[PDB]
Amino acid sequence: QTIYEKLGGENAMKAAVPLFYKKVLADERVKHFFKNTDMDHETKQQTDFLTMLLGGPNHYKGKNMTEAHKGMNLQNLHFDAIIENLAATLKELGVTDAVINEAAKVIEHTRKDMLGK
Numbered sequence: 001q002t003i004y005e006k007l008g009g010e011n012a013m014k015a016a017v018p019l020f021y022k023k024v025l026a027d028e029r030v031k032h033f034f035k036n037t038d039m040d041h042e043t044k045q046q047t048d049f050l051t052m053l054l055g056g057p058n059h060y061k062g063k064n065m066t067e068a069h070k071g072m073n074l075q076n077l078h079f080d081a082i083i084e085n086l087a088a089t090l091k092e093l094g095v096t097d098a099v100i101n102e103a104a105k106v107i108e109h110t111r112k113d114m115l116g117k
């Protein structure tokens with residue numbers, strides 16, 4: 001009963017991260033930010049990061065949230081879009097609203113680290 005376990009553990013996270021990128025890369029609000037991104041790299045880092053954040057194994061060796069988005073001057077509407085797409089991903093994968101909300105509540109603490117950097 002970590003959030004990572006409630007979502008379904010490793011095979012669930014490996015399905016969810018590429019589906020979340022499929023939605024992000026179709027969302028007019030944010031897709032363009034990824035134009036020059038190595039999507040294999042990025043899928044791996046984000047899988048490691050959400051796995052760590054949500055109480056699974058901690059193998060995240062990437063940048064902190066300010067460094068990751070430095071120079072992007074991200075705005076609130078961009079962060080809302082990312083949360084909406086992760087929520088829609090987990091809902092499409094059959095996750096209940098209560099578990100989506102627990103996950104979102106953890107991720108939402110990162111907003112101040114990345115906006116306006």
Ligand code: HEM
Binds near residue numbers: 033
């Ligand atoms: C606010 C809207 C956001 C936008 C537009 C965005 C966009 C990006 C982009 C474009 C990169 C890659 C730069 C590159 O390597 O090509 C990146 C890195 C990353 N972002 Fe975001 N991001 C956002 C929010 C989030 C959130 C909410 C999280 C997780 C909670 C997240 C986690 C990460 C991670 C783990 C990396 C990888 C850092 C590394 O490579 O070491 N981001 N982001």
